[PDB]
Structure formats: C-alpha cells, structure tokens
Amino acid sequence: MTKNTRFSPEVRQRAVRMVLESQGEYDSQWATICSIAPKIGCTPETLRVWVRQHERDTGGDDGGLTTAERQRLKEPERENRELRRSNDILRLASAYFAKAEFDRLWKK
Numbered sequence: 001m002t003k004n005t006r007f008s009p010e011v012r013q014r015a016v017r018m019v020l021e022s023q024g025e026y027d028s029q030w031a032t033i034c035s036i037a038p039k040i041g042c043t044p045e046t047l048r049v050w051v052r053q054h055e056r057d058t059g060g061d062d063g064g065l066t067t068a069e070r071q072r073l074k075e076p077e078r079e080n081r082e083l084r085r086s087n088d089i090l091r092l093a094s095a096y097f098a099k100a101e102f103d104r105l106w107k108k
Helices: 009-025 029-040 044-055
Strands: none
Touching: 009 029, 009 044, 029 044
C-alpha cells in the first residue's frame, strides 16, 4: 500500500561509499559493515544488502538484440580481442625545451 516508501538515495549511496572507504582500512568486510551501520542509523544486515546490490549495480543489461534476417551478421566468440590495432605509445616529451632559454619574466 505504501507508495515509493523506501530509503533515501543520497544516504544509501553515501553509506555504501563509506563502506568502501572503510574497506581500505579494514579488509574484513564484516568488521567494516558492522561498525558503520550504528553511525548512519541502520543494521549491518541491511547495509550489507546495499553493498551487495551496489555490486549488481554494475550489472547492466537489457534484452533487445537486432536480428539478422537476410543480412548475415557475425556472431562472435567469448574472446573480445582488439580490432583497432595499437597506435604509437605517444605522449613522448619531444619538444624544443618547455622552459625559455632566454629570460623575459620581469613580471611575477
């Protein structure tokens, strides 16, 4: 019956963020979650669910593939290998001195 009665997005995202922040400090996930929950005002069990859901947050998908009726498309394998082919590494500092040889800076 309750319409859109749920937790706030900001607090949830910030909660999960603080969990990750504290995962840097504590590698024991339970230690992390159990300590943060009483600060934000939630249970470690629920906070764990938020973190787990935020894991599946990266799981983006959608059923809607273009079908190859008469124009034969190519269905690839599992191996998503490169196609563009490596350019040069580039970004190489080859310039005519970034610093001025003769001075000009009388102004600071």
